[PDB]
Design a protein around this ligand. Structure first.
Ligand SMILES: O=P(O)(O)OC[C@H]1O[C@H](O)[C@H](O)[C@@H](O)[C@@H]1O
Ligand SMILES: O=P(O)(O)OC[C@H]1O[C@H](O)[C@H](O)[C@@H](O)[C@@H]1O
Ligand SMILES: O=P(O)(O)OC[C@H]1O[C@H](O)[C@H](O)[C@@H](O)[C@@H]1O
Ligand SMILES: O=P(O)(O)OC[C@H]1O[C@H](O)[C@H](O)[C@@H](O)[C@@H]1O
Ligand SMILES: O=C([O-])C(=O)[O-]
Ligand SMILES: O=C([O-])C(=O)[O-]
Ligand SMILES: O=C([O-])C(=O)[O-]
Ligand SMILES: O=C([O-])C(=O)[O-]
Ligand SMILES: [Mg+2]
Ligand SMILES: [Mg+2]
Ligand SMILES: [Mg+2]
Ligand SMILES: [Mg+2]
Lengths: 471, 471, 471, 471
């Protein structure tokens, strides 16, 4: 079975009866609640359905709060959706209006102040493209240079305009709050520009007194210019290709992705690859040949996780999207799970020991690798190496099981806290023995530390056969 | 400028006035005439427009005749197109009929004889799926299991159904004939299953007395089971992913592609990657992020050429499709033109010498590599190595220039036959100096052979400064 | 300090007061008692002197019993020594007689039976050479082809001709017995030809009820034809270059040595390089430039140990020979202790774990590597890798400390039997702390096993700071 | 045949009739005339005998003038020799006197000016050692700390103290002159310290109007501190281990040798390894096991040439020494001629092309590699790579044939000045065909350049079959 993790975005297509369950049953490892859309009641109900289904199935499922960030949007159209055709003129305004095909509203209120003639406006990541002709008072007059349908509150991107808006708005702060108290496992911040942007998120966490993993969404050129520092300051990164493809040249993204996945793995942080991986599959029962290739290539690049956005949130074949994504990942991994090697020899205690542990296990044809961890960090330095062996994490903190649902090839087991390393070995033996694929005499390699209960204290590898007294 | 070659399929969207010109000006290296559709007048006019534009611009543009092969398809619907929706029952028949939504005709006349209940029927390379319920006489009664639009005469695929039809039908033979006498540079055979299938093509060529390079289209499991032998028996291969993705599990294709590109490069044969690379761009002015990834990955896999099918033949932005494909290729190549290395050290005189020539040029920071070739084989063994240096082919046979338009990173120059290697050197200097981007004193490495005008006789490398007396 | 081990042969030059002491104080790691010369009281007293000085200094010193083997020699001359000069006729006979210049006897009693005209006889490991002319009944009539003095009972070599003789003679059996009861740590067998020859040695040990490590001396073509099998059947090997250089062409020896060192290291068996390493130091206070090179090259080849024969047994500067040998070894090792890598990845539990432990220690800037062993196998699989870190063996069996004095770069510490991982680790802390050299808080890697007190139980690595609570 | 070159030193043992002949017939590639000993008539007659035997046999034999340098010495003793035994006092003085047991003179006239107490004095490259006690006026008062005999004019070494003495002495200048006019091919300078020391030598050559190759003898710590610069300023280097082993710690030499050979190979300059390689053979018909190892190791280190000093100049088996050295070299080379790879990719035109030529030849199983060279630079960049293919140099300047007799694995052929590429290739065919072992159809790779007759013209490779039309 599968090593690569699957992240699904929830929405209207996942609201019908026990559909969230079906996704979890079909392979969903992380559930993304997008806070760009929806109402607090909708999120809460979604989050409950995940917890029920996770707990009802036995399958770890993390819950990811995606914060809108400084996203610029359109208002509502009187029609709710119109068609903007090439050759037509449209006025985007800062001013409150009844929204229509010829004049529509936007959230960025500095638009007229900051937009100059020539500037480009991309809608829905390139579905329509406009160029600014002039600024007539509080409107921006643009001529449509690529025609298509636009709908209420759709995202617009103004490449090259210095956009001034806070890392976290009040909507963002108030959604962070609601999501932290709801119990989510992780949080993603949109439109990250600096390594210090996490500090603001952290602050709110400290006010509320509850911190979680913060994922950086890489969708700005500034992000890519400070990639290493962002990967060290944040806990994870998402290659957010949609906005990244209109903020950068869309032809540059394939290489940015590859360079960003490598960077995460180097520093042992999870990486998600997102947006239009199976875009075709919103309307079609099978994907394109390019889409299948895009997924297989995200695997061979070394992605911890791949994500589906519209394909599950509003799509018509949300199960087939998750199912197919898994078949492809599995198809690639059957051939080889080997990933692009690291460019350095590990230097941290935990990194070095997890490296050695991988060596021993693979060379002895061990049945599984087992790692004990408080923060998940030990387990992530082994995950990044992409072993074909089952990697099994053992931890006392249940939240870590949900946090490790987006870390590559890792299955977690929650256990009572131990105060002796032999205790730990017995625990492993107990848990493993209840599993179909495990038996007595079977060989496993266990990574551990002492004194137990201490993060980073990992310092021990043990080659153990299930049930024997080799301790 | 670009090294990766772009192959476009011509059709109705290229028959608007001076459109073929625009494509060649925009980057088309090979023009694919698909013999599935169109009539001889349509093809002939297209082929002329390519020769005019090639000759008018100076840009080499090869002409590829794609033979339909044993393709199975539907008839014409009375309304021209219908929608087959999930749940509906449809009868495909051997019998001639008036065609409709409830009963349509097919070309494979053994369908009722060879199709059993359970078997699946995919339409349009996967977009509509049926399963066979029963055989009533000369009908096949199916239930539509995935619903969508079907149009007149569309292709159907009966996976893992032993289909008996000749490698080349009479239509195919008569299209080979028409295309050989029209002057085309290469020929592609569809649905290749054996290495001996080229023999049949060759035979007809010998009857008609004009041989060209034969490309194998890899879209059958048999093809992939005999991949090495097919790549040695044919002159080129195309990874024909549409049919390949319904004849094999669509998740297996990404790896077959990569394995097939490696195999072509090993044996120094051109390889084309085809079908849905930028599928989205038929209707949209920009592609998806998966499509862009699919193209970048075909480059990094090592493809000589990438192809557009519907994106130029019936699409709405055929110019933008070609332009975009080139921007991506170029984006990847600016970073690095490195391909996955060969798995062997060359053994053949031509291979070894072209390898050494690459070495010398790169190590001396040469301005260009120059190779002389009768058949193009010397030039292809250097192309496969993917050098960042300009590779420039010199040949006396003009058809080779068009044959090398689908070989990676190669530019050709036609020259008069010389009878001394001395005279070859001066020829190179003459031609190169008429370029804007060359100067006297520039350093160049020249591969050649003596006695001249003999195939495979390549046996000399010369390190030469433009204009100077080092000969 | 030094990592490469030094083996000295004891003899007349080491019998003056506290000279054995001086050698041990000057670096002798193994003492070789050669049973070809000297008598049991000479050996006994030498053995007493080694154990006194070993015990008095704290330096481990192994004791090696070298058995003469099937050595062929001459009988005794009336004058005790004659001079054979070129051109003369000499008759070596199977008959009984007390020698003279013209006719002398030999111990190989099949000389006349097995020698043909054309064969060669070399005396004193080469410097006096005869060629066989005829066999007249009992005598072998030869011509002296390179003249010089022959003495009583001098060793003669019948290169190329097949000698039939038992692996162990009765003298060898009786010296095995005397040396086993005297309490020697290892035994070397001379002129080994087969992997089955250790069986014979083993048998006698089983009769006598005491087994020790058996070293194979490689000085026969048959030995090198069965090199791998001999290295797997024996516990160690010695490249015995003296006889090897007359039994094989002396020009073949350099490469056999290198190939034999590689073979030992691969299968984790100690290897000694012997004979004339510093030959000129018998007369001279300094060696030649070739001798110095030969020693440095035995180091770089990967030898566990280098040996001195005449340089200490009968030489004039026995102390200086040992001191010089150590300066050179040390000079090479300061530069780099890197040895030619293994041609395989370790496959055995103990091999795999000791490799990983080396990795971790070196990556984490550890102060020492510590390994627990019953027989020494675990410790030798790490020694063979040649680490620059201190390798420290911990064992309850004191004889193993003397056995590991010929294994590369290993210092051994004897401890009481421990019944706990805890116990083991605390013992390490105690021992290491009691050196000036170690401090509390220092970082070390410990290899061990459980259940304790079992050979090959090895299954754990522990990263431990001296004195801390991390167990 | 052999690829490694053998250099022999001539002297008293080579002054018999047809003794010089015997060496050339046995394998001598370079003849070394040592200008420390003997007089101009002795040298002349030696030089005549080399040129006769070279010319009479067809074997290239270079002639090397070794200049004494600023060698420091003792004066003459009244009795011609005395014996200094440990415990004695001796006074070495900068005063004039005829020596005796207790007070002898030296040639370095600054001994008293800059000897300090504590300094050491080795006599006869180490066998007699003294320690400096004081300076009384102009005598240097020492204690004999290792006893032995000293004779007239014996060399003394002042390790550690800075000697000020000119790069070339006046004896050296007038021996340079005598040797240049005698017609020697190369010159070696002793006790080189600086890259500017060759300027001195060059200057004198320019006065006298004849330059030859100048070899640096590496026997000083200053030399090794400036090793790279000396190898770039000089044309060759000799690792002069005798004096190097008393001027540096004798244990440091084996690694300096290896480091110096690598440095020569990298910059494509010949390197000789000298002194005591088979020292034992002066008195013995066979060498030691260490000596044989030292020779094999000089081969595997990558030496162009190995040298014999006393073994041929004053030894009793000069012929056997040369023969033995060759058997061992040959034994190593039969196995593998592989040398430690360069630490850089060639970037000079002639380096790069000679590299490629090696590639082509080996990949095509060519019979030989053929290189045209004016000075030998091109030929030496291929020699340094150690190919198993025959390397054959073609040159018009006959002196270069003798200069290339110390370059690895190279055989030279003298040809006329040509002005034609065709000419050159036919010349190769002519010359090669006169060897039995080359025939028509045989494949050879030829390196050359145009315009002919220019050093560094090199710019072409040609793959040619003997006698065929591939020109
Ligand atoms: O080299 P490693 O041990 O694998 O650690 C890689 C790097 O990224 C980690 O995630 C840590 O934040 C860094 O301190 C570390 O240098
Ligand atoms: O790798 P090389 O030695 O250059 O040759 C490449 C290989 O494929 C080519 O296309 C030839 O058909 C083969 O005979 C050849 O072995
Ligand atoms: O696999 P390793 O740990 O490197 O051990 C290599 C070899 O060592 C010893 O000689 C064992 O007897 C062998 O069975 C083993 O194959
Ligand atoms: O690049 P290569 O031909 O190997 O040369 C590398 C170096 O060695 C040569 O001997 C030259 O003295 C240097 O100028 C040169 O840079
Ligand atoms: O906001 C998004 O959907 C993204 O860019 O991933
Ligand atoms: O025939 C086709 O169009 C194909 O296979 O891609
Ligand atoms: O006895 C030995 O060791 C030898 O022959 O070298
Ligand atoms: O004279 C020499 O060459 C030396 O000192 O080695
Ligand atoms: Mg976004
Ligand atoms: Mg097809
Ligand atoms: Mg022996
Ligand atoms: Mg010297």
């Amino acid at each position: 079975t599968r090593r690569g993790k699957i992240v699904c975005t929830l929405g209207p297509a996942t609201q019908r009866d026990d559909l969230v369950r079906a996704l979890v049953e079909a392979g969903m490892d992380v559930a993304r609640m997008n806070f760009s859309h929806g109402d607090y009641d909708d999120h809460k109900v979604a989050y409950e359905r995940v917890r029920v289904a996770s707990d009802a199935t036995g399958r770890a499922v993390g819950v990811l709060a995606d914060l809108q960030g400084p996203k610029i949007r359109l208002g509502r159209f009187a029609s709710g959706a119109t068609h903007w055709a090439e050759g037509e003129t449209v006025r985007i305004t800062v001013g409150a209006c009844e929204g229509s095909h010829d004049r529509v509203s936007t959230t960025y209120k500095r638009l007229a102040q900051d937009a100059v003639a020539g500037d480009r406006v991309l809608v829905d990541d390139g579905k329509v493209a406009l160029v600014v002709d002039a600024v007539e008072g509080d409107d921006v007059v643009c001529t449509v240079v690529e025609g298509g349908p636009v709908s209420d509150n759709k995202g617009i991107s103004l490449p090259g305009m210095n956009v001034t808006a806070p890392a976290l708005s009040e909507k963002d702060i108030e959604d962070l709050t609601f999501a932290l108290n709801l119990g989510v496992d992780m949080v993603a911040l949109s439109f990250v520009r600096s390594p210090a942007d996490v500090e603001l998120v952290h602050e709110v966490m400290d006010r509320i007194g509850r911190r979680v993993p913060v994922i950086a969404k890489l969708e700005k050129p500034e992000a890519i210019d400070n990639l290493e520092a962002i990967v060290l300051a944040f806990d994870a990164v998402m290659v957010a290709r949609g906005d990244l493809g209109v903020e950068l040249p869309l032809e540059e993204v394939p290489l940015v992705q590859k360079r960003a996945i490598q960077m995460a793995r180097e520093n042992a942080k999870p990486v998600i690859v997102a947006t239009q991986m199976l875009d075709s599959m919103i309307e079609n029962s099978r994907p394109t040949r390019a889409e299948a290739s895009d997924v297989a290539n995200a695997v061979l690049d070394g992605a911890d996780a791949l994500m589906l956005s519209g394909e599950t949130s509003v799509g018509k074949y949300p199960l087939a999207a998750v199912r197919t994504m898994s078949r492809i990942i599995c198809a690639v991994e059957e051939n080889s799970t080997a990933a692009p090697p690291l460019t350095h020899i590990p230097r941290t205690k935990r990194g070095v020991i997890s490296y050695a542990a991988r060596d021993i296990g693979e060379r002895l044809d061990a049945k599984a690798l087992v790692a004990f961890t408080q923060s998940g960090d030990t387990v992530r330095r082994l995950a990044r190496l992409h072993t074909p062996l089952p990697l099994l994490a053992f931890t006392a903190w249940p939240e870590v099981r949900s946090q490790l649902a987006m870390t590559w090839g890792t299955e977690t087991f929650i256990v009572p806290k131990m105060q002796s390393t032999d205790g730990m070995i017995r625990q492993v033996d107990k848990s493993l023995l209840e599993l179909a694929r495990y038996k007595r005499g079977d060989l496993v390699v266990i990574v551990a530390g002492a004194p137990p209960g201490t993060v980073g204290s990992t310092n021990l590898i043990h080659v153990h056969r299930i049930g024997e007294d080799d301790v």
